[PDB]
Amino acid sequence: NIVTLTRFVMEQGRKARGTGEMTQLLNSLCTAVKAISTAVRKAGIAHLYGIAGKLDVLSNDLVINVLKSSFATCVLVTEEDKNAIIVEPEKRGKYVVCFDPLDGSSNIDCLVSIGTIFGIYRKNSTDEPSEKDALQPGRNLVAAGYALYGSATMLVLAMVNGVNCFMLDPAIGEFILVDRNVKIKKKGSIYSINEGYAKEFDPAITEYIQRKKFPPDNSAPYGARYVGSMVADVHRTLVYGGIFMYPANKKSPKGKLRLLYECNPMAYVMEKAGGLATTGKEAVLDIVPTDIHQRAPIILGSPEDVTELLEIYQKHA
Amino acid sequence: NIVTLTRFVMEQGRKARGTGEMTQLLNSLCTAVKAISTAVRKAGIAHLYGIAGKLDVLSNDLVINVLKSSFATCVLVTEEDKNAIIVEPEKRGKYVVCFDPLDGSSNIDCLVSIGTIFGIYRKNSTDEPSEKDALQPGRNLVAAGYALYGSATMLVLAMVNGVNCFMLDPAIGEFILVDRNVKIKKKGSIYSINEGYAKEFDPAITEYIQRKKFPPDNSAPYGARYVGSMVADVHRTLVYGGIFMYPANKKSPKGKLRLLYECNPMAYVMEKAGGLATTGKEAVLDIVPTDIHQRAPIILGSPEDVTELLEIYQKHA
Amino acid sequence: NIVTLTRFVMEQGRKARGTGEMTQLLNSLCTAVKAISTAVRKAGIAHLYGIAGKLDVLSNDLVINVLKSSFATCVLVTEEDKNAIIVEPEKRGKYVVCFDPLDGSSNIDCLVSIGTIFGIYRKNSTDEPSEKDALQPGRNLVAAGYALYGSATMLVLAMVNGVNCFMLDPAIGEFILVDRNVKIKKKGSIYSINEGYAKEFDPAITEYIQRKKFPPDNSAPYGARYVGSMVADVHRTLVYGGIFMYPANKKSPKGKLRLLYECNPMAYVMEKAGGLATTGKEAVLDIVPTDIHQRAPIILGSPEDVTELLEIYQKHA
Amino acid sequence: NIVTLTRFVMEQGRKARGTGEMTQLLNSLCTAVKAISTAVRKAGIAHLYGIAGKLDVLSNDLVINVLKSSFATCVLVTEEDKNAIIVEPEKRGKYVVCFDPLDGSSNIDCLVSIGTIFGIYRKNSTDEPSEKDALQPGRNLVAAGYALYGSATMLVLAMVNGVNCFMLDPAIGEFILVDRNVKIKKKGSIYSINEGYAKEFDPAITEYIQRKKFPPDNSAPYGARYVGSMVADVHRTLVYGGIFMYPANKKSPKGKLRLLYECNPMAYVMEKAGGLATTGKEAVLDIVPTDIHQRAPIILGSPEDVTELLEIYQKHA
């Protein structure tokens, strides 16, 4: 009585009486992620080193061809491509897929955890697909999730029904459901932010950080953690509780994280897990995108920690 | 032409005119690390999940068994064991090995990078082997290094002639030399410390951090990173540059990090790479331990960043 | 534009407007075969050998639990169980599955190729499932096939539409379609039989063998091949052409190979591939089984080679 | 406690007081075999099938490159190369290696067991290294063995002190000693020969086969097996007992099997295991080659079965 991703996706496609198109899509994603995982852990590297006489780019190509080979997509948006990819009408399905094929690429030389992030929208409208089809607020997401290539490979999938975590068994190449209907803690004890940007923080963030290090009610201070790869930082937030933040600063008054393929999927996982995701002023899932590579400030995590900071944001409002 | 860890170790052992006792020890280590890597990556997990027919305890058991069978060790010191382990006379060799089988174990549920740390001493006072044989300053290390299980598995080996990084190709189970004679940048641009302890930092540390966030000469502040796993943080330092800190505070008046199997091996690596590793008052390698599970304050990284901090310490002295 | 077993099975389930039950079944089989393949190639053997301090039986259990976990089966027949396994009504589906979890087990110590063989029937009737549900002639098979664990792992799947071959990529744990709509050669140049039973052969087999070694029309003689594992011998027959035979002798006047889980699936693959499978008197697929472990003589392969021998069988009739 | 090929080789090399030159050669071989095994098992095939972003030539290239880099060889002899390969003086060592990189290559499309065969000689006449250095009788082998890629990968190594089998654990890329000091049964019960050449067999062979099918003393006839891959057939002989035959016929008046890299290594293995290996007229190891691609008749296996056949030869002499 074990549950594999392949079994789960099919039973769910059956319960929802789908035509099987989304199921074929989710299966192609599962296959793409296993292929990326393998290249990340460097299997075959000996060949590059002459035993017999890129990564971001390879990841992009894998995700694109595998997704197109699903016959379930019409518009693809990648962090790696300036323009949205419109699918050939022969393989054109009804899904729009926004993804970051390998987030944290600059961490690669340091062997820090990296991941793949994706959000799926159903093409709403009836005209020649285009970038406009991806410009939907995150509230319209059919599914969203990410794959984390850390000490082990994990796929976290969020859909209307909830959040589920699947661990990859690289021996048989199968994702096994290990955490079902996940819920984030109401209050965590870790905060995550790049404090090297201190001089740039708005007063509300500055005050919050101060409350965490020197608690006014004399409670224990929060521990700090900042891996430097969103997928790793968010996954730790989801599993262990706490708050993650990447607010605005000189690096764009608009934030650094991209709305469509970084913030939205994460905000979606967070909300389905019972947490919050806000820009400080509004909920991330409610922002109407105007540009496929639009950035946005984001704060996510345990609801009590996010509301606490939202209050400070009010006090300074 | 390609260089595997197996060939390199043997070659070095040949140039050193060794009896091949250390070579066997190093081959054993390599075998232990590949085994731990496989377990960490979760191969075979489908079995726990009943496709019908603890990770730090297994790691401990693997290291101890694999090292004993090398017939090259007489005294073992593990983070996991209260007392030193004395090898049976039948299996005795002349080496003392101090290791942390799986560091960052708390981080396991969050899939954060973890690693194995080891330091190798040669038994000097030839009395019956005992705990006192491990009580040697790090300046007496013959070899030290670590294995990091991150996006990929890497083994860094440092010996008197320098530091070398080997990447694991899991397809053929062989470590390939990917970086020769490593040297750390003179000055970095990332500082790594758990700022959650700000309330308890000594003055020098407090001044240094603030200097990194608000540099006097209005230059770019240092970026910040803190994975919360020493091997991961120390490996990013060695490779990318910067400074790593785990100073003395209240919950740990002498630091959290253990001297024999965490601070020494890492300080040795740092020093052979041209970096510094201090306690704030003194070099970590010169400290003569008195207890095998002794703790010690540690600051390591690019020579200029560490020097700058040490000047500040002297200033408050 | 690559085709994985998972994609293929789903598109075919869609074309046939299935409810998705057979598809879930085929997916469970694919997963069982990858798990068996891994144990066959001995991954993890170091643990049996004490690195940190059956096969036929393990294969049976994997296939049974994985199949039951599909919720698509009601009656399971295994070469390893005296009695047919009736599925719990909770997980009871509509399919009857006959399989040999690991054929050629006595070859294991010699590392000869071995495999898994399976035939699927739709439960015809409407009463409490039982052994009687498996007692159908092979002509009623919905699907049949085998997995060969040889130099590489291959899954050959035969359905009403034809025969397809999928090679396993153990790096990503995915079967890739490599040979589509396979057809056996009309005439081969290799014959396969255990000639150690010469003294026991009926006159027709004896004459045929004689024609192959000393051709009366002076054509080149046929080469001989006899691996000793049916799956290996049949797979070579399917791919390279020729004839395979295991007629009756003192080892049962009834043959050695079992009808339900060895002969039928193979006869089915053969026929779908355009070849023949006969007992010498009748077509194997047409025999009405009377006992789940019933044996039967079998001759299969290229149609011209099988008809040639059938003629000799007539001459001696 | 467990024994890996790496430890065993080093230990043996220590007991022999070698300079570690042969040890490096043997470590190189091991690395080459693991690499070939991975390629044979088809890892990464999904790439040829365009998940978008010859096996005997690659094997040849792997062996040659990996052996050259060992700095232990001066002359290489491959089944795949017309002339011997002379290693650059910069990389010269004292050993001559004769190998078949991938034997049974015809069998690849049929997924039949294949293997690698090697024999190691020490350069004696110290003139400029040349082809003549490989022209040594097998009685002069320092080491020989083979790697079989069957249901699992095994490496059999024979040296003056005996024959040892190592099983590859692909999870950690390590060969584990699974069988120590192997010895073949005195008498077997399987004979292995391509009976398709019956029309061309000499009288002795013809009598022997018939004696196996119809034993005078009405005892059980020998079972027959003929995989068609020497390593597979010879490995079943060593492990299970019996006799393997590839006599002289018409299409091959001196046999098909080559002396230097097929017959010698296998005869050496057989002899250290307590078996016999003859040409019919003489022991294979005593033959002094005159051409590097020379062919030779071979009969090997249990000492009693081979003797019996040799008596029959003498009878027709």
Ligand SMILES: Nc1ncnc2c1ncn2[C@@H]1O[C@H](COP(=O)(O)O)[C@@H](O)[C@H]1O
């Ligand atoms: N595997 C599945 N899991 C959960 N919901 C599904 C699945 N397949 C389809 N659905 C749902 O049913 C809708 C239509 O399915 P489809 O016909 O495949 O496009 C989807 O957009 C989801 O809302």
Ligand SMILES: Nc1ncnc2c1ncn2[C@@H]1O[C@H](COP(=O)(O)O)[C@@H](O)[C@H]1O
């Ligand atoms: N593989 C090696 N790599 C580097 N140094 C070595 C190696 N083998 C031996 N040496 C050195 O030679 C000394 C004696 O080696 P041993 O006789 O094997 O105990 C060691 O303690 C090292 O200092």
Ligand SMILES: Nc1ncnc2c1ncn2[C@@H]1O[C@H](COP(=O)(O)O)[C@@H](O)[C@H]1O
């Ligand atoms: N994956 C599939 N491939 C080919 N035929 C299928 C598939 N699924 C179902 N069918 C066919 O449709 C019938 C009923 O499907 P099902 O509703 O799943 O039981 C099967 O028995 C086959 O005859």
Ligand SMILES: Nc1ncnc2c1ncn2[C@@H]1O[C@H](COP(=O)(O)O)[C@@H](O)[C@H]1O
């Ligand atoms: N690893 C080993 N295993 C068995 N015998 C060895 C080993 N190493 C060296 N010897 C033997 O010692 C001789 C010289 O070794 P070498 O100096 O390395 O060239 C060889 O030719 C073998 O006869």
Ligand SMILES: O=P(O)(O)OC[C@@H]1O[C@H](COP(=O)(O)O)[C@@H](O)[C@@H]1O
């Ligand atoms: O390189 P990417 O693909 O844009 O992602 C890097 C991002 O960079 C953030 C960290 O940025 P700072 O270095 O500015 O903190 C992470 O949280 C995200 O992973």
Ligand SMILES: O=P(O)(O)OC[C@@H]1O[C@H](COP(=O)(O)O)[C@@H](O)[C@@H]1O
């Ligand atoms: O779980 P361990 O073996 O004690 O290791 C955790 C150690 O803990 C340090 C961080 O601890 P803090 O949470 O106190 O910062 C790391 O740098 C070391 O990896």
Ligand SMILES: O=P(O)(O)OC[C@@H]1O[C@H](COP(=O)(O)O)[C@@H](O)[C@@H]1O
């Ligand atoms: O051991 P199993 O599972 O019954 O299968 C062995 C069978 O045995 C046949 C060979 O039998 P002989 O040794 O009698 O030739 C093969 O063709 C089949 O694989």
Ligand SMILES: O=P(O)(O)OC[C@@H]1O[C@H](COP(=O)(O)O)[C@@H](O)[C@@H]1O
């Ligand atoms: O393809 P190769 O390298 O020539 O090897 C085939 C050889 O051929 C022999 C069998 O050949 P026949 O078909 O003539 O029996 C085997 O025993 C050897 O493995």
Ligand SMILES: [Mn+2]
């Ligand atoms: Mn990216």
Ligand SMILES: [Mn+2]
């Ligand atoms: Mn990104």
Ligand SMILES: [Mn+2]
């Ligand atoms: Mn530990």
Ligand SMILES: [Mn+2]
């Ligand atoms: Mn530790």
Ligand SMILES: [Mn+2]
């Ligand atoms: Mn069986």
Ligand SMILES: [Mn+2]
């Ligand atoms: Mn069987």
Ligand SMILES: [Mn+2]
């Ligand atoms: Mn060859």
Ligand SMILES: [Mn+2]
């Ligand atoms: Mn050959």
